[PDB]
């Protein structure tokens, strides 16, 4: 699928924290940046995610806030 | 403030699209990545954002989905 | 791309209301259900959406609330 | 109450997966479509949800993305 | 309707900023606190919201972050 | 940090329910209102949150719906 989400950032899974119905996937997206994703355990399984998997961090633009110092 | 949001990514503003009540801020966060943020025009003004401003893309972890390529067969 | 979002509902575009930076797409997913999506104008154009387009309403499970009468 | 959320889709609970502080509710909304919802366990209990309950999937329009087959 | 959203804060509309497809509704919830809501113009119209209307700010718990003084 | 989020509501923590990857923090913001926040256990710990902590409920304007009677 091609998705409307403005942010689709390629990266590699560096850690997966398994929970009860959700888990937290951490992706190394390059440039010294990592992104954490809290998604359902069902999806972690269905997408076959493991540490070292290639994946994408997908974020709708309306979910992104801006901060400054 | 220190914020719970797991994702707080430093970057530089490369473009701002001004709308009616919202606008879209594009941040270059390095490594060839850009992040687009759709936020209120009021916030854009109050934060003094301009092209070239240093800022952060702030994303709650529950807002981030994971994708894989179409030819991966889990 | 294949996505973690638990909800990926096939439907046809029945209307697009254009805004300044966002627009609102209405998708008929069948059975008398329609879904409204508020997304960037950039995305509406990039996906080539028009009345009658085949598409999907994509919703993260953590964005779905449950209501009762 | 009546809510601004543009999407309020009637359906029946087909499953509830209990987690620690959240659970996942699946609703059959008709037309062969199901909606999965990740909400607090407290809300699952407070709303009296069980398999067979009548309910609604409620989604804010700004939470909905559009995808296409990009063949 | 009764909703799973854990946050439902009563207040009065103090302002509505109309946009193109969205508008921004501000509610006075008391205590010198206001909540701003960015929602569709269609909903603002359908709910009959005007300055002075009694309403509620409704927020899913997964949408709320916590911040602290550093 | 200063944040674009239009809603930044001061309050005191009155409850913490710990989960597997998430927890739920309840903040009393005054006027008889409490705001519940479902966030990662990691952040709950990193922010040092306990019953009695002073904190803020932070909500993006696009996450706030309006309801009426
Ligand atoms: O155009 Mo989006 O789907 O709001 O990022
Ligand atoms: O721990 Mo968060 O605020 O869900 O990213
Ligand atoms: O939270 Mo999900 O598993 O991306 O719908
Ligand atoms: O295009 Mo808007 O109405 O400023 O979100
Ligand atoms: O008008 Mo809404 O509450 O953004 O779906
Ligand atoms: O109940 Mo959890 O901590 O969201 O899996
Ligand atoms: O996640 Mo909730 O339990 O709908 O606020
Ligand atoms: O959409 Mo905002 O201006 O980050 O609350």
Numbering used by the authors:
A (entry chain B), C (entry chain C), F (entry chain D): 1 to 69
B (entry chain A): 1 to 74
D (entry chain E): 1 to 71
E (entry chain F): 1 to 70
Q: What did the original publication write about this model?
A:
Here, we characterized E. limosum Tub, a tungsten storage protein. Tub has a sub-nanomolar affinity for tungstate and contains a single TOBE domain first characterized in a molybdate storage protein. Crystal structures revealed Tub assembles as a hexamer composed of a trimer of dimers, capable of binding eight tungstate oxyanions at two distinct binding sites located at inter-subunit interfaces. Tub enables E. limosum to accumulate W and then supplies W for two tungstoenzymes needed for conversion of lactate to SCFAs.
A native-gel shift assay of rTub showed that it also bound molybdate and retained its oligomeric nature. Tub demonstrates comparable binding behavior for both tungstate and molybdate in vitro. Similarly, Mo-loaded Tub exhibited the same thermal stability as the W-loaded form and was also resistant to trypsin digestion. While it also binds molybdate in vitro, E. limosum cells preferentially take up W rather than Mo, and its physiological role appears to be to bind tungstate. Whether or not a TOBE protein binds molybdate or tungstate cannot be determined by sequence or structural information alone.
